[PDB]
Write an enzyme that holds these catalytic residues in place. Structure first.
Site, short mmCIF file in Angstrom:
data_model
loop_
_atom_site.label_atom_id
_atom_site.label_comp_id
_atom_site.label_asym_id
_atom_site.label_seq_id
_atom_site.Cartn_x
_atom_site.Cartn_y
_atom_site.Cartn_z
N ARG A 105 -4.31 -6.79 9.05
CA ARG A 105 -3.39 -6.06 8.13
C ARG A 105 -3.33 -6.68 6.73
O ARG A 105 -2.46 -6.24 5.95
CB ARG A 105 -1.99 -6.00 8.76
CG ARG A 105 -2.00 -5.94 10.28
CD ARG A 105 -0.63 -5.81 10.91
NE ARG A 105 0.34 -5.23 10.00
CZ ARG A 105 1.42 -5.87 9.55
NH1 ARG A 105 1.44 -7.19 9.54
NH2 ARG A 105 2.46 -5.19 9.11
N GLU A 116 -5.82 2.34 8.44
CA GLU A 116 -4.56 2.99 8.16
C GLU A 116 -4.44 2.98 6.65
O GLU A 116 -4.17 1.95 6.04
CB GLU A 116 -3.40 2.23 8.81
CG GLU A 116 -3.52 2.14 10.33
CD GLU A 116 -2.49 1.25 11.00
OE1 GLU A 116 -1.54 0.81 10.32
OE2 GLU A 116 -2.65 1.00 12.22
N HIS A 157 -4.56 -1.38 6.85
CA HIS A 157 -4.62 -2.12 8.11
C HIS A 157 -5.85 -1.62 8.87
O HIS A 157 -5.92 -0.45 9.21
CB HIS A 157 -3.35 -1.93 8.95
CG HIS A 157 -2.06 -2.16 8.22
ND1 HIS A 157 -0.91 -1.49 8.60
CD2 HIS A 157 -1.79 -2.87 7.10
CE1 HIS A 157 0.03 -1.86 7.75
NE2 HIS A 157 -0.45 -2.67 6.81
N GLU A 181 -2.84 3.65 3.24
CA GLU A 181 -1.60 3.87 2.52
C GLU A 181 -1.89 4.20 1.06
O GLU A 181 -2.85 3.69 0.49
CB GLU A 181 -0.69 2.64 2.61
CG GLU A 181 0.03 2.52 3.94
CD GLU A 181 0.91 1.30 4.12
OE1 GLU A 181 0.74 0.32 3.36
OE2 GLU A 181 1.78 1.32 5.02
N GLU A 236 0.81 7.62 4.35
CA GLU A 236 -0.25 6.97 5.11
C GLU A 236 -1.01 7.99 5.91
O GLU A 236 -0.41 8.90 6.48
CB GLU A 236 0.33 5.90 6.03
CG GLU A 236 -0.69 5.02 6.72
CD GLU A 236 -0.07 4.00 7.65
OE1 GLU A 236 0.52 4.41 8.67
OE2 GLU A 236 -0.24 2.78 7.39
N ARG A 275 5.48 -8.96 16.97
CA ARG A 275 5.56 -9.66 15.68
C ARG A 275 4.49 -9.14 14.70
O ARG A 275 3.39 -8.81 15.13
CB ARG A 275 5.40 -11.17 15.90
MG LIG Z 1 -0.18 -0.91 11.37
#
Ligand SMILES: [Mg+2]
Ligand SMILES: [Mg+2]
Lengths: 209, 431, 434
Positions: free
Chosen positions: B322, B120, B232, B122, B183, B303
């Site tokens: 992450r 992922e 991530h 960003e 992202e 969480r």
């Molecule tokens: Mg994520």
């Protein structure tokens, strides 16, 4: 299904390359996930995963409504209004669209159907150094005509873009205050009307920019 | 063969120049531009160059024929080839990050293991003032916002289109929490193809942003007080074609292999941070109050821990690391997670208890009771932990490991001696 | 009496307002301005105020009559102003242990019980910067060097005014000169007791900053205001006296240095990592503790020829003394001298032998040869010094649990704010490439 086959026909015909999975937060602000056209089959089938913390103001699925597939009139782009469900499949009761759907289903049990036709007022302001202001673009009054109403081309484009998305407007006119306008919507069910209200705000703000 | 296909695309698209792409130990893309007449020489005996650029002396560029792509920005046309570095004799240069990942993947392939990664990515899109880049967001948008609030929709649309034209499939793209932050979520692919894809995305995003008078940056924390950019990494391990992380009979449908892989990554996570969070700025991202993990915990989807275990099961069973940021070298990052994760599977390393409670909301006395560790606070602190990790130093090789330490300590020694503006603002008037 | 002398100076110089000066744990001067009509109340039962300012509630200001001085900058209409350094005490009458001046007084009284008196003569370095748009800058007023003379040293008139104003307040100065860096200067103080010297250090900072503003400039005692140039240090010339005679001199011992000198040095060097939190209290203080400049970084002691943390100069007899070169002028002098006294006296009491004198140039030696001699390093960051100070039970007990906790709380609040910040260096180094 056939609605899905209809969507893929329009995709190849208008050369749609990206699709916006639209949805709305508790405050009515439109949110979306842009996916390339290759992922459209995955969106209409098992759905696209995302983070539901945005809806409040952490894992959910976007469920596109096939009846809401519209090509954005401005390679082409398309949109799909989505309902939110939890990863298991149950509908998320925090989704505003799902809340109106529930209340309409309860009314439908008693044989009641509510039709809404809102009168949408808004302002068209000037921009200073790329940032928005509260300075009216025009110095017009109630039901005024051009050149007193300077925003006649922008309003003409708004209604034209809406008609190109299965949307019918009753009438539009300049309002009392300077740079203020109104677009009167035709009657429709509460869900279609609410979808239409969100679309109008998005189109009006996009064409104004 | 693949070489015959390359020359057919050359004559079809009228390619006149090809870029022999490669990356240094820091993940920065480097290249040698050769005219199309020398393409036969590059695919055969290879093109010679000076390998001291990888450190941050003479070697040969070995193009990967599967990575031949025509750059969509029409010049005459241009093409690129991701290259592996070899010594003049023919043996592979152990200092090449791409070769390091390839080795570690070949070691995993001997044990029937294949790692799939879906990062992922960003990044921020900033304005440019006087031809120089700034840290001023182009847009004033928030999480998953739509235009006109998200002004970078055309630049993002153009990025994904250019990527699709180079055999690249993207899952989804959206606006992130911070102003001007975005992202692009990639789909699952092998560690090598994914790392090649990560380098291509950074190159395309920065090139296309300059075309629009903007600056795209993959810096971990460009602005103080707002969310920082993370990478991530959705990771899944496959054993003989099947998902090694799925077991329908086990509790929560989690195989023992997932637990041991998580345990191995968490054991060496302090050392991995030097690779996955390599800049001095990367530690300004690892601070509480933002999306980035700071405490060393693993938990379920609800969480937000360092390692997350999402709900999808079956062939989509996977973990989400992450802690990394998009400024890391993807070749070295995936090699470090593979080596640490496989050591956990091999040595049967049990991970700590899942922390389902909100770790940020707990007081220090509660966090101390549950035995929650913390990620390194400074680059110097992560490099000291990486120095002692014999597994990662051997997995990345003595050449790559030493280059990482030398570059990081050169930056740290320069950064620590500097007198920052914060000090003048806090002490000049009073003292 | 001293109160009668104060009121005679009041009527003579026409003093109309008095400043009840005091200092917080950080060494920053604080005051309560009272009209001359309330001076009798101040010298008698005392003036009440809020003690929340000292940390960084109701208490009393106790003026020290020996510290009454008329401020030489004559006020409007022939009216004059005066100042009085005050000790803080609780409403019941007991001295408030959080007051830095009271802490130094306690530690000096403990030394006096054993017949020991410490004399300090600090070398105060500072910078004189320009002002742009009413705000201070880090741009040197002058482009002068080491011991330079005008017109190379443009701050000769202001330095002349500083020493003149100090002499007009019972303050004798040894010498003043331009330092290595551009716009940097030094004022060397004469030797005096720890309390008088600390009072004098606070007065100098106040006078230098006030007179700099008068000339449209800004004087700063910051340890490292500019990167790449020399930083401001406070080299504290220290001497210990037992029953009137110099306890550091022994004519029969080698080098004419007594055992008391070696044990004092050994004690200071043992707790020097912890003392650094007090003597180098800002985050910026560690940007000064870097190699290549006058400031000591390695923990060594030696003769005059080599520049080390502790340096034993050539003068002997009543002028026998050591020079602790690690502190910077941003430290609280009351706490810095109390910490040096407590660590030095612990060395004398417990007979702590110091390490071997490192006469070789420590900077020129390679990193391999330093470990072999057991050479240590001063803390690299403020957090690193605070962690060492927290564990030093001697200094925490000498400064008191109130002062020690306030130092830790203020330093960690600054550290936690500084570490999270994204400095311009990071944007310059990573924004374009990554
Ligand atoms: Mg994520
Ligand atoms: Mg000196």
């Amino acid at each position: 299904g056939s609605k899905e086959d209809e969507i893929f026909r329009i995709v190849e015909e208008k050369n749609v390359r990206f699709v916006r999975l639209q949805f709305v937060d508790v405050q009515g602000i439109p949110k979306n996930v842009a996916i390339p056209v290759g992922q459209l089959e995955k969106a209409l089938g098992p759905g696209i995963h995302f983070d539901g913390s945005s809806i409040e103001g952490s894992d959910m699925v976007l469920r596109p409504d096939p009846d809401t597939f519209r090509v954005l009139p401005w390679t082409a782009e398309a949109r799909l209004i989505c309902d939110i469900e939890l990863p298991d499949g149950k509908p998320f009761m925090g989704c505003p669209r799902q809340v109106l759907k529930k209340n309409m289903e309860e009314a439908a049990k008693l044989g009641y159907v509510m039709n809404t036709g809102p009168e949408m007022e808004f302002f068209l302001f000037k921009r200073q150094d790329g940032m928005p202001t509260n300075i009216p673009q025009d110095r017009g009054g109630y039901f005024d005509l051009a050149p007193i109403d300077l925003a006649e081309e922008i309003k003409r484009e708004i209604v034209l873009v809406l008609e190109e998305m299965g949307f019918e407007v009753e009438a539009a006119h300049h309002e009392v205050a300077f740079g203020q306008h109104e677009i009167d919507f035709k009657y429709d069910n509460a869900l279609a009307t609410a979808d239409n209200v969100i679309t109008l705000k998005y189109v009006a703000k996009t064409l104004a920019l | 063969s693949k070489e015959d296909e390359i020359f057919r695309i050359v004559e079809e698209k009228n390619v006149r120049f090809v870029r022999l792409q490669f990356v240094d130990v820091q993940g920065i893309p480097k290249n040698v531009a050769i005219p199309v007449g020398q393409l036969e020489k590059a695919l055969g005996p290879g093109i010679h160059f000076d390998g001291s650029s990888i450190e941050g002396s003479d070697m040969v560029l070995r193009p990967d024929p599967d990575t031949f792509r025509v750059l969509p920005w029409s010049g005459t046309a241009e093409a690129r080839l991701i290259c592996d570095i070899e010594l003049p004799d023919g043996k592979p240069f152990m200092g090449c990050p791409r070769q390091v990942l390839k080795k570690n993947m070949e070691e995993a392939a001997k044990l029937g293991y294949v790692m799939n990664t879906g990062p992922e990515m960003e990044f921020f899109l900033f304005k440019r003032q006087d031809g120089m880049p700034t840290n001023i967001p182009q847009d004033r948008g928030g999480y998953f916002d739509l235009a006109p609030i998200d002004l970078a929709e055309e630049i993002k649309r153009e990025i994904v289109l250019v990527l699709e034209e180079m055999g690249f499939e993207v899952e989804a793209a959206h606006h992130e929490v911070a102003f001007g932050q975005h992202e692009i979520d990639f789909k699952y692919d092998n560690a090598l193809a994914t790392a090649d894809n990560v380098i291509t995305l950074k190159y395309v995003a920065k090139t296309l942003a300059l075309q629009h008078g903007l600056h795209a940056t993959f810096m971990p924390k460009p602005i103080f007080g707002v969310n920082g950019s993370g990478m991530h990494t959705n990771t899944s391990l496959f054993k003989d074609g099947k998902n090694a992380f799925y077991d329908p009979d086990a509790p929560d449908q989690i195989s023992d292999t997932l637990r041991y892989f998580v345990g191995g990554v968490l054991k060496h996570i302090r050392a991995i941070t030097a690779i996955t969070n390599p800049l001095v700025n990367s530690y300004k991202r690892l601070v509480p109050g933002y999306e980035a993990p700071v405490y060393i915990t693993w938990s379920g989807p609800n969480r937000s821990s360092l390692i997350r275990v999402p709900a999808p099961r079956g062939n989509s069973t996977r973990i989400e690391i992450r802690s990394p940021d998009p400024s890391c070298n993807p070749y070295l990052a995936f090699a470090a997670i593979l080596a640490a994760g496989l050591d956990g599977v091999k040595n049967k390393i049990e991970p700590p208890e899942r922390v389902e409670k909100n770790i940020y909301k707990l007081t220090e006395e509660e966090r101390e009771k549950l035995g929650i560790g913390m990620l390194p606070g400074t680059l110097k602190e992560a490099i000291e932990c990486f120095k002692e990790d014999e597994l990662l130093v051997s997995a990345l090789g003595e050449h790559v490991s030493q280059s990482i330490i030398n570059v990081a300590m050169a930056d740290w020694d320069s950064y620590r001696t500097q007198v920052h503006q914060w000090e003048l603002d806090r002490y000049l008037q009073t003292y």
